Design a protein around this ligand. Structure first.
Ligand SMILES: [Ca+2]
Ligand SMILES: [Ca+2]
Ligand SMILES: [Ca+2]
Ligand SMILES: [Ca+2]
Lengths: 236, 541, 541, 224
């Protein structure tokens, strides 16, 4: 490794020698975004019946398939509670079948925008990993039990209202509390999904909540494939 | 692997979108800004530039600054990636002695001085102001110490064909944010305008001692450095002929131009953590790069002394200096000096931001007037969180209450606050006065004038001399002491009638005189004074 | 596997066809020029040579120049790949002081000077034209400061057997586009034509200070450097005999030739971003190659001072210099000095290009006359975007209004300009006047002549001497002050009648006289004057 | 700085520098304001051939002859020996202004050559040995070393480290007034060669290369 080679790969990504088009590079960056979640997650989303679309620049519903139709009726879909639909770039249409609309942006350069995509993907496939038939698949119930009050630094996975309600009820194992706040359970799973698969900060989940990391690691090392082939064999 | 272009240790996306260094179980951890769990513990959200190894161009990294793997003498506000760490050392002169060049026990004159760091601006209208140099002016005491000493030239006994020698005690002082380790700078002593008397060149590496920030080199519990006193390898005195002595007695003022040659830089060594002076690094390599890519701000809120800090701002013509984060004026004040907003109002220890005065050079005033034009506002104190800073700006925040001379030193206030400052009496007597005057107000008072008034009203000034105003003394408990006995032959105030009135006057540093007037005027006739004290003779006892 | 012959970092096709440097979110990208998406954002289209490591042959690369990874004191106009970055330092002389070689207190002459960088051109008819070295000619003041000083030789008391010594205060100034870091050049003081009095040689490594562009080495708020006043080891003064003193008193002008030895070059270091003085590089290896492959343009539109830039043009003999991009004259003016086209017309801050006077030397005149003939045009201002530049071209743009001497200094304009420039009268009084004269016009005025016109009309000149025209002053706010009090025994103007006219004249520097004339003329008879100020006596007060 | 016709592979590139003398002043060895004589000169490079028939012509050396002006400048100045006021037991001193000039095709960079001043046939008056590396300046082809807008080099004038004058006794003064001609034999010691460096293109003076190694090989394989 001479000085010339060290300088030559010091500027390996600063010189874009083949650019030639503006919206042809956003497409390559969106493809490189989506190609690093594993194959089993995408195949679970297809066996559920899901769609993913790389639309052009039309933020509010100029998109003809997310057009003036069935839509969100809420106050919170980000990691906070904004939903200012003029300034969104990912939405999921899941009424009769799942369908994900991903606007194309510069995802290799922005890493905060590149996390809402994984958050909505994990929101989409939440109810088929968090449950088996109509339940909470009680490994996940033991997980939320182990993260409820046993760690003050596992409030990165819960909302504010879910935290105060789980504080007030304080013994939530019953099926009364489970079906009253299932959206918060999906929120916790999807937020751990986005923290696990964003490349820059996975170790924040490994540090501040070390047992959710084990759940996600076993998922990635074969639970996704298991639930995929289960839904496949049920599909025939 | 993660991309890291500048090669300091922090990945790019963290440096662009925010990061902080948290301490888990006991180990440290460099994490992105999770707003839920990092805001509770009171951590700071950092931002840097992903293509500079040191965003403020100072010789410490971004990683080293945020994680604490730095020299521990580096000032605490220079632990931020956006505040530069560099030394600003000048020379403090304590007292001088003057004698003729050769029985010389009464043929000398010994006076105390007063040294302050200067920021020489432009002349008003009848002659870009702010430039990079360390200089300070001294102020030899014009008043008397003995009973009847007078007439400096005749006190020393000089004629036209005589030369005088100079000797003084100096002390270096580092008011920057980084320490010097072996080398001391080479100051020169300038009289008048360009008449350089001597160059002080205290020999390097006869010391090995540290000049930390906010500290003196011969520390305050040691003895000062004497100018040309010991003669070990200094066979030359500091000579001064009669003409220069005449200008020195006319002005009673000198100047000490200190240059910027410092030593080496002490850097953290990653194998055993030993901070060791590196012979490769040098401050001469670093200081121009700091001076070209940052925006200085000068402030005198803590006391009436100027403090210079430099904050790393963008520069729109440069592609590498468009990488640094956006710096507003409010954030620069909050991270460099120590301002905070308790309720929503930016204030520096109680004093609100509207009590301070903004001054720029020409370029900055143009640059900021254009921002106020396109922001559609007229008050800079309202939009203080939207004024973007760029590189090579120069701002000067100073206090509104006072009046400043050419060197931006506080030399006087208006009358109303001087009268308000003296409305706390602890004890009153015919021997003196006990008051709680504030420490900043009492820095602009040259001395006092005491007089006695008849019951019908008369004007009898006790100490009717220009060199007899130093009747104030300060005790360490924090309470001043005026004294009538100092120029009344050690005898108290002679009250003739208990229904008399006592009148004490105050003269600020812009109004006092240092030399008698053209004919013989050692009188306090044409001196602008201020009513401070008016009680009766039956109330002081 | 892209081709890169020169190893600067940019691939060949980018360097030939156009490239630009753009900052995204916070990172910098070097991408080719795509016209529709790049012109909107306001970016610059760069073009370079694919076979030189630096197209302008200076020590900074093409990559380092356009991407900002350069020593930050390199001037912003020299960050283009086609503008050379090299220092041009000359010596500025503040004041001289002349004493006789050994009661000598009123036997010295202390005068103010005026130093300007010169560009000596071709002589007219009775003696490559433009030569490349730094030289400046001082001009000693011929007026009087003492009320009754006359006759320099008898002012000092100089005889034919005596010798006279010289002392002066100088300071250096870098007007180029790169800094000098440790070494200062060795200037030499030539008097007359070839009579070198002394060689001013600064001590080696007596400084570690940077000499940045547009900056002085002893800065404007410090003390200047004095020639041989230090004495000690260098007690060798600068001695003139009687004939040389008579030549100096006749001519009142010296010359300071400065050579081109500078220090080393400070280079960016890609690992930790540190700018450090490289002992491997040197300016003397670079300056010939800059001087042989570039085209020089000299321009004085900002102020009446000559400013030299060099632009990398082709040389059709060498195949390595046929690789550089094509450089028209218009683009050279736009990227080197700061001209622009707001509405189609090439102008320099309001002043159109047609107010400037193109002057080439011999070879360039032939080279450009051929292009004008083959373009079938006669007005050069029309085809300014088709005149191709080549290597070793010397062009000299200057302002059309004034008249220039042999060293291309403006020494006095047409009279109609001087009359127009004095049409703003602010204050009229018996003691003086206040006018808003322009900064450019006030460079060429040597002094003023005051006389009184009667109601009939007479002539009585108050300052009727060649060395008494110095009356004018300037307040710093922007208002000059003419003064009749200076040569009227400190008594005001004797308005004998309110129906009189007070005639004031102006004399330019090409019409003034600095010596007594042939027989005895210490009078202003043979001095060409311009009518400036003639109003009634009752509009004055 | 290599001359444009030496860009051909078949034309050699090498420096040919000689000394140009501008004006001389002559005075007696010690009131000397009219006891001097100042004359302008004229220097030309020579190519000394064979004598006609009554005494291979062309050889490798740099030499030039000067021609002191024989005419007058004042109204009635005459008789050089009596103008200076010399007798048989007097010695005179010499001082002049010189300028080097490179008429070859390559530049010299630091070192200047060491010429000698020859009067008559072999009477060497002095050797001019202007101190190397007190300069760092270039002597390009077709250019003078103290350039024409600067001041010339004065022979033995400043005396900084030169305590010896250029003395001349009465007999040599007689031959000088008889001939009004000198000679300046300049040798061929030059500096180093500045070579192109292929990584960054910097032309830099190489301490390995030297003109003394190259010049005999040029002189043996070429045709002048
Ligand atoms: Ca980094
Ligand atoms: Ca960084
Ligand atoms: Ca290239
Ligand atoms: Ca190139």
């Amino acid at each position: 490794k001479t000085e010339k080679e060290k300088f030559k790969d010091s500027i390996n990504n600063l010189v874009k020698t083949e650019f030639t088009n503006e919206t042809l590079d956003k497409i390559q960056q969106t493809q490189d975004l989506l190609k690093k979640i594993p194959k089993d997650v995408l195949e679970i989303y297809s066996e559920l019946g899901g769609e993913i679309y790389f639309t052009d620049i039309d933020l509010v519903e100029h998109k003809e398939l997310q057009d003036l139709s069935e839509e969100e009726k809420n106050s919170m879909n980000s990691r906070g509670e904004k939903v200012p639909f003029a300034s969104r770039f990912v939405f999921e249409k899941k009424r009769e079948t799942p369908k994900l609309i991903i606007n194309i942006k510069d995802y290799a350069i922005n890493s905060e925008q590149s996390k809402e995509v994984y958050y909505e993907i994990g929101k989409g496939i939440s109810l088929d990993i968090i449950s088996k038939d109509k339940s909470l698949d009680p490994e996940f119930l033991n997980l939320i039990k182990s993260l409820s009050d046993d760690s003050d630094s596992s409030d990165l996975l819960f909302s504010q209202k879910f935290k105060e309600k789980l504080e007030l009820n304080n013994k939530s194992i019953d099926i009364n509390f489970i079906k009253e706040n299932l959206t918060e359970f999906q929120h916790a799973f999807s937020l751990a999904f986005s923290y696990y698969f964003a490349p820059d900060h996975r170790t924040v989940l490994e540090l501040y909540a070390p047992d959710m990391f084990e759940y996600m690691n076993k998922l990635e090392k074969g639970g996704f494939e298991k639930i995929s082939e289960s839904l496949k064999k049920e599909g025939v | 692997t993660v991309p890291d272009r500048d090669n300091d240790g922090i990945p790019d996306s963290l440096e662009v979108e925010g990061y902080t260094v948290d301490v888990k179980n006991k180990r440290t951890f460099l994490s992105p800004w999770i707003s839920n769990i990092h805001e509770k513990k009171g951590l700071t959200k950092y931002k840097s530039s992903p293509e500079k190894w040191s965003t403020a161009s100072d010789p410490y990294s971004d990683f080293e600054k945020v994680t604490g793997r730095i020299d521990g003498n580096v000032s605490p506000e220079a632990n931020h990636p956006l505040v530069a760490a560099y030394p600003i050392v000048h020379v403090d002169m304590e007292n001088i002695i003057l004698s003729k060049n050769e029985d010389s026990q009464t043929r000398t004159i010994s006076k105390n001085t007063s040294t302050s760091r200067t920021h020489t601006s432009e002349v008003h209208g009848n002659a870009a102001g702010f430039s990079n140099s360390n200089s300070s002016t001294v102020a030899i005491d014009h008043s008397l110490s003995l009973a009847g000493e007078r007439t400096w030239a005749e006190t020393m006994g000089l004629n036209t064909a005589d030369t005088a020698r100079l000797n003084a005690n100096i002390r270096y002082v580092n008011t920057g944010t980084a320490p010097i380790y072996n080398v001391l700078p080479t100051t020169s002593l300038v009289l008048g305008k360009n008449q350089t008397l001597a160059t002080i060149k205290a020999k390097e590496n006869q010391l090995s001692q540290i000049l930390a920030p906010n500290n003196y080199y011969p520390s305050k519990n040691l003895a000062p450095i004497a100018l040309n006193a010991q003669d070990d390898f200094s066979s030359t005195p500091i000579t001064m002929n009669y003409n220069q002595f005449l200008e020195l007695e006319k002005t009673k003022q000198l100047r000490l131009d200190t240059d910027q040659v410092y030593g080496n830089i002490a850097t953290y060594n990653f194998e055993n953590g030993r901070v060791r002076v590196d012979t490769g690094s040098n401050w001469s390599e670093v200081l121009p790069q700091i001076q070209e890519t940052t925006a200085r701000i000068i402030f005198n809120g803590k006391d009436l002394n100027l403090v210079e800090r430099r904050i790393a701002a963008v520069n729109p013509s440069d592609p590498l200096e468009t990488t640094k984060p956006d710096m507003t004026l409010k954030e620069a004040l909050k991270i460099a000096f120590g301002f905070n907003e308790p309720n929503g109002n930016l204030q520096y220890q109680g004093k609100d931001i509207t009590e301070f005065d903004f001054n720029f050079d020409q370029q900055t005033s143009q640059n900021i007037k254009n921002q106020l034009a396109e922001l559609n506002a007229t008050n800079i104190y309202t939009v203080l969180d939207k004024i973007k800073l760029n590189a090579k700006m120069n701002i000067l925040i100073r206090d509104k209450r006072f009046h400043y001379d050419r060197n931006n030193i506080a030399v006087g206030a208006d009358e109303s606050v001087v009268k308000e400052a003296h409305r706390e009496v602890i004890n009153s007597s015919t021997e003196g006065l006990l008051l709680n005057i504030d420490k900043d107000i009492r820095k602009i008072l040259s001395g006092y004038i005491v007089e006695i008034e008849d019951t019908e009203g008369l004007k009898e000034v006790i100490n009717d001399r220009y060199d007899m105003l130093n009747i104030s003394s300060l005790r360490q408990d924090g309470k001043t002491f005026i004294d009538f006995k100092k120029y009344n032959d050690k005898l108290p105030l002679y009250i003739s009638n208990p229904n008399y009135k006592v009148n004490v006057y105050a003269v600020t540093k812009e109004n006092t005189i240092i030399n008698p007037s053209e004919n013989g005027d050692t009188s306090t006739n044409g001196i602008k004074k201020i009513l401070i004290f008016s009680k009766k003779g039956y109330e002081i006892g």
